Amino acid sequence: KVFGRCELAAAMKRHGLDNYRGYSLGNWVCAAKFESNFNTQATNRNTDGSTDYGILQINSRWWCNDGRTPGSRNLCNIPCSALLSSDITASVNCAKKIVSDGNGMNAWVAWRNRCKGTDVQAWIRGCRL
C-alpha cells in the first residue's frame, strides 16, 4: 500500500508514534517519505546481503527474520514479510524498539541526512487533526 502523507501521519499517531522518545510526528513521516516513499511493500538489498523492508526500511541484519541473512538477529521477533503489510502495526512496534536502542532516529540514514534539523513540522502541515 502507498500511503498519502496525512493518511500515514494519522495512522502513525493512532499507533503511538507522535512524540515517541521525544520525536515529533513530522520526524517519522519525513523518515517514511525518504526511506520508502510511503510504500509499505518497498524492499532494498544492502551490500552485506541483508535487506531493508517496509515503509521504514527495517533491516534484516538485526531486527527481522528473512531466512537469508546469515548470522543476523531477529530483535523484533517477526518475519520481515510482516513489515510489508498494508497495516503498519508491525513496522511501528519494531520502529519503537529501534529508536529506544541508544541511537534514536540516527538508525535511519535517510532521517539523519534529509530530515534531521530541517523543519519536519511541514510534513504534517494541513493534516486533519
Swiss-Prot record:
CDD domains: LYZ_C
Localization annotation: Secreted
Keyword ATP-binding attributed: no
S-S bonds: C6-C127, C30-C115, C64-C80, C76-C94
Active site: E35, D52
GO molecular function, one term: beta-N-acetylglucosaminidase activity
GO BP terms in the entry: cell wall macromolecule catabolic process; defense response to bacterium; defense response to Gram-negative bacterium; defense response to Gram-positive bacterium; killing of cells of another organism
Expressing tissues: In the egg white and polymorphonuclear leukocytes.
EC number(s) stated in the UniProt entry for this protein: 3.2.1.17
Binding site for substrate: D101
SUPFAM superfamilies given in the database record: Lysozyme-like (SSF53955)
Transmembrane segments: none
GO CC field: cytoplasm; endoplasmic reticulum; extracellular space
Keyword presence, Secreted: yes
Enzyme category, top tier: hydrolase
Alphabetical UniProt keywords: Allergen, Antimicrobial, Bacteriolytic enzyme, Disulfide bond, Glycosidase, Hydrolase, Secreted, Signal
Catalyzed reaction equations: Hydrolysis of (1->4)-beta-linkages between N-acetylmuramic acid and N-acetyl-D-glucosamine residues in a peptidoglycan and between N-acetyl-D-glucosamine residues in chitodextrins
PROSITE patterns: GLYCOSYL_HYDROL_F22_1, GLYCOSYL_HYDROL_F22_2
Matches recorded under SMART domains: LYZ1
Major location category of this protein: secreted
Location of the C-type lysozyme domain: 1-129
Complex and partners: Monomer.
Described purpose of this protein according to its UniProt entry: Lysozymes have primarily a bacteriolytic function; those in tissues and body fluids are associated with the monocyte-macrophage system and enhance the activity of immunoagents. Has bacteriolytic activity against M.luteus.
Misc note: Lysozyme C is capable of both hydrolysis and transglycosylation; it also shows a slight esterase activity. It acts rapidly on both peptide-substituted and unsubstituted peptidoglycan, and slowly on chitin oligosaccharides.
Name under which the protein is recorded: Lysozyme C
Species, as recorded: Gallus gallus (Chicken)
Encoding gene per record: LYZ
